[model samples]
Target chain A: NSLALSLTADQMVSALLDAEPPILYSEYDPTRPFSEASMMGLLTNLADRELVHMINWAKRVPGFVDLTSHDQVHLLECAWLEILMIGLVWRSMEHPGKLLFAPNLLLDRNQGKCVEGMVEIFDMLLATSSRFRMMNLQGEEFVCLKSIILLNSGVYTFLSSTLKSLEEKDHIHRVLDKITDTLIHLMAKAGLTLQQQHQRLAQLLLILSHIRHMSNKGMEHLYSVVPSYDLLLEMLDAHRLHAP
Target chain B: SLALSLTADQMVSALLDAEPPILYSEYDPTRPFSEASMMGLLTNLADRELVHMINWAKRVPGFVDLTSHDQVHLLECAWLEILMIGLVWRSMEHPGKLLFAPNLLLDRNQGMVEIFDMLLATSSRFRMMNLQGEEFVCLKSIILLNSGVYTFKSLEEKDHIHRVLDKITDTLIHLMAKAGLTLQQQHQRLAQLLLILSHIRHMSNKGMEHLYSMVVPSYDLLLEMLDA
Candidate 1:
């Protein structure tokens, strides 16, 4: 209820809030579902249940029709954590690590080292859920928690403070730009979304066109300031025309 | 009835009885804290007794003569810390990762915090006659324990955690004075400890409880000590 705002806006609020992260031992004891039988069984089961869960939600979203491809890894990471903690690993250090140091045992529950990977999944899930509204409460809560963890991190403190002023001034463009900047920062670490100038410049042009799509009074008068997606795309092509 | 039990108090008392060598002068004076940390580990430890506990309890003979690191790995570090360390290692990569589910970290953290706190309080207030080995095993182990728990809010704190690490050796000395041993004698005690614990450890057999005299110290009251 506190953040009934659209999922994207909620993400922005919490992303700016998470500062010091909780530090404790992580407890993961799940086995990899890599074997032939396990994979087949997992796919068969999810194909059945997830279809029921996402049908209506998928139909309404613009780019979510093919969730099967995207959501696979995310689901596995979440499931694995659950299985691993069925019980604590190695009751004591003197307790056998299990068969010459536990060949079959799941992860130990006290390891705090796996959070980096999970944090990315949390972010991607939140971003994806934002596009597809009407997600279940559980999904929403996950997004909020992930958001809090992201907190108010700055990619570049020098620029962030100046930009914070614009945010304070409620300059819509600056606020959006700052969020995009944070995404790019985290994205680079997660091995998603290249932030190189050429591709990003093209994407920025597309965003400008996307903004024009927004309904506003006298919006056409500002078309010159914000380049259309076509123009940005053409500019990219123009640059590439002379490239090796 | 509980009187029959060797109280945590007696354990702490026996553990800290001898004066710790003034590790402050062992190395550069300017770096007393670092030297102290090391001295506390190397000179501290009923480690002999603890090693004996696991050597007998786990029935792994010939383990006492093991390298100090091996000894630690077998005893408390292995038996006690390994379960936590393995996960702690994985968690180093990801912050705020939940173990079983998305929010499990949220759920179990409170309880684990208390246990980690308890471990620190139990281990503190001792002369480390044995560092965990590997040159700084004992010192590093002490540092790492605090590292993991610093992430959690205090569950079992004794004095200030940072202060404990900072003045751990001095505290051992202070506690040792109360037990009546001189600085020169403390070093001699450590040399004798290595030989004694090794012998006791080698000779210790299965279920061989070297159960020492018990002293009553209310663990619950320990929670009340800001240091505890």
Candidate 2:
């Protein structure tokens, strides 16, 4: 007594009449079969449920607080888009004997980009090391030490052990790459964003570079051009231009 | 791309069908496809050529100078080259210009050895002071102060290029390394870099044999030779 879970568009449309309250008809109903207004009305009703679901989801989303308002919206939008894209490529290629799209999705392109993007959206997702507690966003990128340490911590805490082998190392590198890339891209862009409250440690360097006797406000404009990273740290990270 | 292959002349020629009713084929719809097809065809071919002709940069030095726009532009240029060389979608007009554009592709193993040597033309130039020297000078000594090279291009030009390089490589390493790509993927990139390095090194001077000992041993200098 296994029931099939999927149907073609034509099959589903045709079956809509048979499901749910038997779809009563009226003599005056011009949309006795189907109509644009009716379809749109269907979507509108669905929207209410969607809105509530998203609000609930956002309220409880694990890393939601780490994103900015703009990034939160973008992350959700991208995640959905990614879902659809994966479904499509997956279905279109259901000869799944050929390829499993999930790893590719999880590894890069879609899921990784969104999660990576998430880091920049709101600063700092819940750091696992901090035991599900929110922490500073580390507006700058992770350095070699931080990179290894944070990754090692995440592995033991989340994966339950340290990684092993060339393959594991390779896989870890890939994950780190996506997260770091997205973060770096966002940080690079953070330059153009206009913000008054959040100045980072790298911005602290501007204070050092332009250490004339002046109030912090006097330095904001000067510090604006400087990246919000520790200059020395940024250099070290930059030299990591090529590594396995 | 078209099911049928056409000669250069045929490619420049027209179809017998009158979708335009002989008045227009759309390039210059004000008129139609009489004398227009050849010109339209030529122009489309040329723009494609222009794209291929510009040397694309995938990854480069100079962190601040690179940007997304630059990366996109270079990817497009590279893709167009892919199109033209009859490599991927062979039939499209391979840009005549791609055969003659700027020749600095920096990843260590991007293309073929002969292709790299021929393209970079770096061998004719000094490996040290002139070639690397010029590039190092251009690095603005932001890294090493004594080697001294200050860029004086318009601020926009400098900044834009810097952003472009940064974005391009940032994305490249991020995606390539993070995606857990198959060895095939890394293998392909490695091959390409080899090609690219050969292109650059060939153009750069091997210079005097003794000069190799004299040049500063920055990883930046021997980056490719050692890897190769």
Candidate 3:
């Protein structure tokens, strides 16, 4: 059976755009020392809140739950960190030399050094945001990119068993295609030539590999810190964070 | 550098016990001359074996600790090799007869005998080695873990699986040492046993190709396992 589709490209993009939650800021006392324990505490607290938003955002990604229950959980477990990193990159893209972890919590390279191994990860994040800034990444592209990241993170080899029918697989492909279609349409609306659109799309997709690299670094950093938050621990475990 | 907490003897005991008992398919051999009947019997036996293999893998020590994704990926990649190990082990004693299940046996004159020519050769090699139950169990565990040594996504998970394989291999060596063999004999035995894995890998790929060519009705699990 073929999946039914009624949404237009604009409707699809708008739906995704509308589904994004309002920015939530982290709470950290400015008077607290920028020690390892305190910085990790602030980051963990922010991660806990971002995870809630990420889960809700994923559920609303139009046709996400239409995937098998197992696949839905598998995707979230594999790519939640990457999705969160995308948001961090988008938020900090305009602001050079610092990471906008949240509206209220910001840290530059030196400030991040209080936490062991944070400097390297912060540098990677800063570089990615700078790349996005150079491209003048837009909201439409950012939302579509997040959707693509979430959908594409899990390798589809083992998902066949969990998939119910060919239609579900078809639906997944269609959803991804629709997202890409929206991205190109947005690019076109911004007055790019066809070659430029192709080049821009290629660059956006290429950025995903780097995002994954940064995501891995972020996972390693979190693994090192060993957060105590229950949700954070669960995400870490799902991402295969184990003792070295 | 973490060591398996269990001693080699204890590890083999656990591995041997973890394996599910042989399942007998309800193939009425008396009336299975038709190609359709033969295909039906083969698919039925495969379905039963796939379920049994999954249960067996989960029970293997250290398997449950893997992330569910890794566990699933490893199983998908190695189920055929695992099955081939069992296939060769069971048919080793019967010479030319291929035992797809305890009750479902096929000889050279059977309709699908050509498909298992490589399997028959592997079983003959296994017989030449005089493979034992403990060796077979360890070999199966190694094949399962080895399937993903280079392919697993997580570096830590890959390393953890490799360590698991090493523990099982060490247990195999320990088992040989305890069997009163000399050091040279033990070395030879271990080398031969490990070398057989490459043959099994070849047979597993052949099995996948055979399954891909055949049209087996109502076997979703079989199709899913081969879908990769």
Candidate 4:
């Protein structure tokens, strides 16, 4: 069943975010809290686990599997960062300037300032977190935003040219459109004036660009700075292995 | 990009001299630019350059001739790297100065060191390759028509891609001959030029990441008043 109009946005985002964080690998590390290997290993594991579960979650979306396998891969690649950020931001809600990388690991922005790129990214995450906080953005708004990012027009640039591609693309956008309508309805239900509703929606959509920029930097960190990056390659392979 | 060639230096100069417009239209070098004004100028210029680059790519005969959803994907993927190359080249003309627009200079002392490092590296690599304007223009077209963006597209598109590259290579070789380069020397230079592009892609990826890091959180915020 389509989630657009059927549920509150928070419930939709929470449902999409239902996957539990993976268990930490059995490595002795508590004594050396800031060990390079330990922190790097932790980040890689988090990304790897998040990616696998995200792939499985997409599979559960009705009609996702039937899309051309290439289209499915394209969607996954394009949408991966957005989904990852959704989970990250969701976790950061409790802590103001710190990022909850895992259940036990909370990175304070100032603490991370020592690293080459950490400060820059950490600060961005906090800013985004604060904006989400300021807007008091509900789960409905986030879920709809994720859907909008997933069905973005950029996907059209790479879908395999076919009748199937056209049909599935149409289906994806149609669902996304309905989701937006639901979001607007939900905003009204929340008692926002019409003008405020419009402003809020615009503000929410703009977050997509901000999140994209944030995620790209995160990916750069993953690809270059993280020591055990093969963990990400492994996750990518998992997405392909399960591909139809 | 495999089928490469050399072209006349004169012709290359003539082609590249038709430079893209200055990035900041109303940038005044003598006047102090506030951070907000600088950012506004950059955003406007960036949008215009993207449009200009897209139109330029569309006119590349090889690109127009190729065949998919695949077409636009390849174009978009290549465009980011190609734009980075042009920016790097511009930066090279004024050492120690990062030029966002013709008159607009990034304050050197307060510059983002890591970002400029990567940009400078790409610029230097292009210099080492002795990359000419015509060669870069042809490379842009070659990159646009590349088949690598999507593995599932048609073979004929690839065939057309190869032939177009081959024709460009012919033009390049003729130019190299006129410039008095040996065939062996030409091959070495071609190989180096392609290698430079690989580095260019890395720099662009890093540059975007750095830009996001330095700019996003710094700028896109709504101040909240708290009752302490």
How many steric clashes between backbone atoms does each model show? 48, 46, 0, 10
Return the top candidate by TM-score: 3
Second chain TM-score, each model: 0.20, 0.25, 0.87, 0.74
Q: Rank by TM-score, descending?
A: 3, 4, 2, 1
Specify the poorest-scoring 10-residue window by lDDT in model 2 chain B: B142-151
Candidate 2: which stretches are off by over 4 Å?
Answer: A1-32, A58-62, A77-244, B1-228
> TM-score for model 2?
0.20
Best by lDDT: 3
Higher-lDDT candidate of 3 and 4: 3
Q: How accurate locally is residue B221 in candidate 3, as Cα lDDT from 0 to 100?
A: 48
| Residue-by-residue lDDT tens digits, candidate 3, B111-187 | 43544766776687678668889989988887777664433347677657756765776677688888887644554
Q: Give lDDT: candidate 1, residue A223.
A: 23
lDDT of 2 by residue, B101-218 (tens): 1221133253333333332332221221122222221121111110011112444543443333233222333344455755334323322222222122112222212133332223
Proportion of true inter-chain contacts also present in candidate 2: 0.00
- How many angstroms is residue B18 displaced in model 2 relative to the true structure, after the best TM-score fit? 37
What is the Å distance of residue B159 in model 1 from its true position? 32
Sorted on lDDT, highest at the top, how do the candidates line up? 3, 4, 1, 2
lDDT of 2 by residue, A108-184 (tens): 12322222232221111111112111223331322211222222222211111234333342343343333323333
lDDT of 1 by residue, B1-228 (tens): 121233324423433332122111123346544344432332232232233333232222122223333233224312223223222322323333412111122222433343333222222211223322121222222322232221221322312332333232333333445556664333233222222111111112100211121011132322232121
- The digit string of per-residue lDDT tens for model 1 on A126-187 reads 22222122212132223222221111111111122355433332232233233343333433
Q: Give the top-scoring candidate (DockQ).
A: 4
lDDT by residue (tens digit), candidate 4, B105-172: 66446555665665665565466456676677655554555413222246566555545545555555
